[PDB]
Amino acid sequence: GTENLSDVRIKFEHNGERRIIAFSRPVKYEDVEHKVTTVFGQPLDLHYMNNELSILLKNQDDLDKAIDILDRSSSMKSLRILLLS
Ligand SMILES: [Ca+2]
């Protein structure tokens, strides 16, 4: 935190607006959830999205698998997350 002052860049989309927020590894599900609530001023569900599919991320295991997609892809530079109330 203060020490922090390989990150995972998450591109959040909420109501058509996008922004990128970086998270240090290992990325904790509870930390992403907290950052979303803090930044957007309300809790929002995390949906990993590609051009065709989205999947709700329910827990650390789901988040780890989504980050692994990111890490296995040479072209993907951020993790696309659709936020829904
Ligand atoms: Ca990558």
UniProtKB/Swiss-Prot annotation:
Residue ranges of coiled coil: none
Q: Which residues form the PB1 domain?
A: 7-85
What domain of life does the native source organism fall in? Answer: Eukaryota
What the protein does comes down to: Component of a protein kinase signal transduction cascade. Mediates activation of the NF-kappa-B, AP1 and DDIT3 transcriptional regulators.
What family is this protein classified in? Belongs to the protein kinase superfamily. STE Ser/Thr protein kinase family. MAP kinase kinase kinase subfamily.
Quaternary assembly: Binds both upstream activators and downstream substrates in multimolecular complexes. Part of a complex with MAP2K3, RAC1 and CCM2. Interacts with MAP2K5 and SPAG9.
Q: Which disease is it linked to?
A: Cerebral cavernous malformations 5: A form of cerebral cavernous malformations, a congenital vascular anomaly of the central nervous system that can result in hemorrhagic stroke, seizures, recurrent headaches, and focal neurologic deficits. The lesions are characterized by grossly enlarged blood vessels consisting of a single layer of endothelium and without any intervening neural tissue, ranging in diameter from a few millimeters to several centimeters.
Q: What name has this protein been given in UniProt? A: Mitogen-activated protein kinase kinase kinase 3
Q: Which organism is it from?
A: Homo sapiens (Human)
Shown segment, full-protein numbering: 43 to 122 of 626
